[PDB]
Amino acid sequence: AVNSKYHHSCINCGGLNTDERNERGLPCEVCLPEDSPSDIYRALLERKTLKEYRFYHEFWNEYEDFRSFFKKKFGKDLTGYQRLWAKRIVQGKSFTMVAPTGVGKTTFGMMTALWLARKGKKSALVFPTVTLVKQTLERLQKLADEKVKIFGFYSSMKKEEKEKFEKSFEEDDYHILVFSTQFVSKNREKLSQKRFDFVFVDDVDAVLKASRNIDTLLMMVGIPEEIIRKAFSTIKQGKIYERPKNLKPGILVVSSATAKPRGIRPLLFRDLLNFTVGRLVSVARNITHVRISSRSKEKLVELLEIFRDGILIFAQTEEEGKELYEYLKRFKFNVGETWSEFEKNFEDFKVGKINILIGVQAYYGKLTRGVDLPERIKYVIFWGTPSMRFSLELDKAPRFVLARVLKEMGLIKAQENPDVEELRKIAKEHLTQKEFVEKVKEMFRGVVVKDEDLELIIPDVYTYIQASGRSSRILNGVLVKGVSVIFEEDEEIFESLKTRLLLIAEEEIIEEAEANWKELVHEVEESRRRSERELTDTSRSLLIIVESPTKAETLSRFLGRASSRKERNIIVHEAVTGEGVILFTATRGHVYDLVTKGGIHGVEEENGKFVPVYNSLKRCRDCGYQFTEDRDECPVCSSKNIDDKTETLRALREISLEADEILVATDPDVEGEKISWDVTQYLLPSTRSLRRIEMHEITRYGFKKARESVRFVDFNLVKAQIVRRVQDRWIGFELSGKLQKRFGRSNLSAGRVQSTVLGWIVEREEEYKKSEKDFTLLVLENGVNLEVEGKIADDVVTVVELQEAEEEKNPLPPYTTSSALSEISQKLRLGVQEVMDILQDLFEKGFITFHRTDSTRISLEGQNVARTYLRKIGKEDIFMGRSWSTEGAHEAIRPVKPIDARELEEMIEEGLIADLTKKHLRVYELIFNRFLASQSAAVKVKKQIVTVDVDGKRMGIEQIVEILRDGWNLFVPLTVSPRFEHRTYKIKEKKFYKKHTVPLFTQASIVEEMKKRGIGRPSTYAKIVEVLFRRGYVYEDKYKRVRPTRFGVMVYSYLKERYEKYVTEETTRRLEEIMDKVERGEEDYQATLRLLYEEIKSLMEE
Ligand SMILES: [Zn+2]
Ligand SMILES: [Zn+2]
C-alpha cells in the first residue's frame, strides 16, 4: 500500500502492475480493468486476456484432484509432508522425501502411481527387498481400478505371471511396474529405453550401491544419454551444470538416504532433476543435559531406580564398561552388555527384556548401524565425557598440536604442514619436553591439558551430540523429550564440553542440584505417551526467505540441509523440524530498484502523488555491473551471464505454491523491510500466507524469538527506505549532472551526505594548518610526560594543589555501529568499510547481534551471556549487569555466545567452525571485550587532581594513581600514572616541536563526527566514507589520515560555489531527522517527497 509500480509483477501477463493491485491478488489494469471482479480466472477469460493465471488455476484444481483421490482411496487427508509432495507431483518435479520415518512414504508412492494411471501415465515403483515387491503389489491390487494395469516381478515369481510381465514390458500395455532394486541392475537396457512419468524409490542406498543405476534412473524419466554425460563432464570439472530449458523429465521421487551419499555421480540428480540426494539430518532435538560432579556408582544406581527403563549407559573404555556391568548385574538390574553378546542383548533391549544397555563410545554406533531405536532409548548416561585423547609426549604428539606450537614460534611456514615425523624433528631440535607441554598450555585455549599424565584431552562434542540424540527424535510427529546425564568429575573437561555444545548445538548442561529428576522423567514419559496416541497429524511446511546466502548457509547449520532444490536462480534447502518441514532460500540480495527513465529520474507523478517505479535488478556475474533495464547483454561488457532477479522472483512464486506458510526473514532495518515488501507483494497474487520475521540474531534462539514476534510488513519502514532512496537518486543525479558539465566524469555525486562529509575534509585542511601552535614536551623525573604551550624555559615545575579522591570508574557503553567503526578501525588499522564487512560477516554467521544498531541497549538474555562467560572464567564476582538503554529498535553489537576470540580461534583450527579469517577474530575480540567490560563491575580507583605551575601558568592534570579493586580492568586496560607529591619536580628533558590542536580527519574520526553532528545512519556510515575514496575525492597519507585530493577539492569548490545551501550540514541533518520520523510514522511519506521535489526543482533552475 505504498503506491509503487513493479515491472514484472502482474501474475497474468508477467508485466508491469502496481503495488496496490498485487497486494489484493489482482492482475494488472490491462489484464483486468475491473477493480473488484467476481472470479479473477473467469474475469480474465471474458476479457480474452487470460494468459498465465491459467497455470495457477490448473495447478490448484489438479492438486485438489489428487487430494480428493487420496482421501477416497485411503481413510483420511494428506499429511503435511504429503501436501508438499503432492504439489511437487502436479508440477512434474523430482525430489527426495524429506520426512521422518513412520509418516507413510510408501503409501504416498502407491497413490501417486495410481493417480497418474488415471491419466494414462506410466510409472515404475522400485523397492529394495523382494518381500516388499509382492507386499506393494498386494496393496495395489485392492486399491486399483479394473482399468489399472499393474505388473510385478520378484525372486519367487510364478511361471504364468513371469511371462505376462515380460510380454507387457515390450508391448507398453502397462500402467504400474513394481520391481526390485536388483532388477534395475540386471535389466539396465530394457529400462533405459522406456520413458516413465513417475519413478518411486523406497531406498536410495540400495540403488546407489552401483553408480550405473544413476544413469539408468535418469534415462528412465526421459533424460538423454548425451545430456547425462555432458552434465557429468561439468560436475567432474567442478562447476554446476544447467540443463536444457526445453527438457521435460519425468518425476523421480526417492527416499532419504541412511548412509553417506559418497561419490560425484549422485550430483547428477542435482543438475538434471534439480534435487539433492542427501541423508536425513537429526537437528530436531529435545534434550535436558544434566551433569554430576562425581563418577560415583551410588548416584548411578539411584538414577536407574528413577529412570527404570530405556537407559543407554555409554562407557568410555571396554574395561570400565566391564566394571560397571559387573556392579549393575550385582544389583539385580536387567542390564545387557554390547561387547560379547551384542546382537542378543540388543534385540532383547529393543523388545523390552533388558532395561539398561551398556555400550562403549568407540563402537556402539558402528555396530548399531541400521537400527536407531528412538522408541526405546530415553535416558542416555555418560560414564565420563566422550572425548578424544592425544599423547603430549613429543614422540607421540599429533600433527595439529605441533602446528600451533611451531607456528607461534615462527619455525614452520604458513602453508601446508610437512610430514608429522618431520615436524617432530623440528620440535625436538628446538623445544624441551617440559617446555613443549607448557607452550601447549598457554596457546591451546579451548582444550584440556593435563601435565602429570602427559595427556591432551579434547571433548568430542560431535560424538556427545550423536549419542545424546538417541534419546530424542520425531516419533509420530512428536519430538519426544530425552535426558542425558554426564558423570564427569573433571571441571575443566566439563567446561570445555559445555562451550562446545553451546557453539554447535546451542544446548546447555545444567548441574545436578538444578535438575528436578521427577519432573524430567514425567516430561519424557508423558511425551512418549503423547506420541503413542493417534494424534491425527499436525505437520506444516514453512518457507523462510532470507536475502543473504551467508545467512541461509548458517540457518542450514542449526536446521539441517537434508536436500537442496535447484529453482531457476535460487536454491531452496529443506530440513526436518518438529513442527514439520522447513524450507529456506537466499534471495542473493536486492530484487528491485528504481528505473532511470520514467518521469523524474524514475519516479512518476499521477494525481499529484509520486509513484516510484521499480524494475528487477540484474547483476553481471563477470564484471559485477548492476543494472535495472531489461537487456540481453550486459551494458558494460556485453556478457549474457547476468544474475537476473526476475528469475529469482519467478522461482519464489513457484515455490510459494508448495509451502503452507511463508516468512520473509530479511535484516531488521529499513533496507531489509523494502526487500521484504518487494517479495511479499510479488507473492501475494499466488499465496496469502506471508508474514515478516525480524532476526536480530542468526541462531536457533534468534530464529525462535523472531517468530514469537511475527508480524506483517511495516509500511512506515518501507516508505522511509523510499524517501532516502529517492533523495540519493534525485540529488545524486542532478548534482552529478551539473558536475558532468564542469569536469566530464560520469558519476561525481553520490548524494547529499557524502558532499557534506567531503566539505568537512576539504575545509579541515586550513583548520589544521591554521591550528599549528608551538608546543614543548616536558619529561619529569618520577613523573609523567607533560605537553604544554611553547617556549618553556623555567626548568622546574611546582605543584600548587593536590587532591586525592576515590572514584568508581564506570565502563564505556557497548559498541554501536558508530562506536564499532570508530574504535575497531582505529585499533586494527583498517578502513571503516572493511570493518563494516567484518561486522556484517559475524552477524550473518551467528556470532554477534545485529550490527546495524544505534542503541546501547543490552537485553536480559545478553547480560546472561557475560554472566555465563564470567562464571566459566572464574571471575563471576566482577559481573555487574547493565541494561545501558531502555530505548532502541535493536540492541547493541554484542557476542551472542559466551565464547571469546581465543576460544573461537581454537575451534576454527580444530575444525568445529569454519569461515572466520584472522581479521574476523580480531574484530570479534574487540566486540567481546567492550561488551564484557560493559557488563563488568566499575573499577574502584584512586584519582589525583594536580595544579602545577609551569613558567607562571597554572596547568591542571587529572590522573589515576591506584586501582583499589579490579573490575572491567580485565577486558579493557586502565593505566595507572605515577603518583604526584607536593614538591618541585625538575624537568629532565624538554622537546620543542609544533603540534596542531585541530587534528586531521581519519576514517574513524569521520564516523565519529557524523554521529556527533547528526548526519548519517548506521546503515550508511561506512558507505559514505568509502564512496569518497572510490570516486577519488580523498586519500590516506603515510599516517593513515584522510586528506582530500586535488580533484576532490575542485569538486567541492564547485559545490560550495553554486549549490552550497543544498550541501550544507544543517540541511542534511534536518532531512536525516525527517526521514527518521517517516520511519516512525511521524512525518508524511508523500509530503516529504513533495519537499524533496521542490528542492530538486530549484536545483535545475540554478
Ligand atoms: Zn497483466
Ligand atoms: Zn558486465
Numbering used by the authors: 2 to 1103
Q: What do the authors of the reporting publication say about this deposited model?
A:
Reverse gyrase is a bacterial/archaeal type IA DNA topoisomerase that catalyzes the ATP-dependent introduction of positive supercoils into DNA. The general architecture of reverse gyrase has become evident from crystal structures of the enzymes from Archaeoglobus fulgidus and Thermotoga maritima. Both enzymes are large (>120 kDa) monomeric entities that consist of a helicase domain containing the ATP-binding site and a type IA topoisomerase domain fused on the same poly­peptide chain. The two parts of reverse gyrase, the helicase domain and the topoisomerase domain, are structurally connected by the latch, an insertion in the helicase subdomain H2. The latch couples the activity of the helicase domain to strand passage.
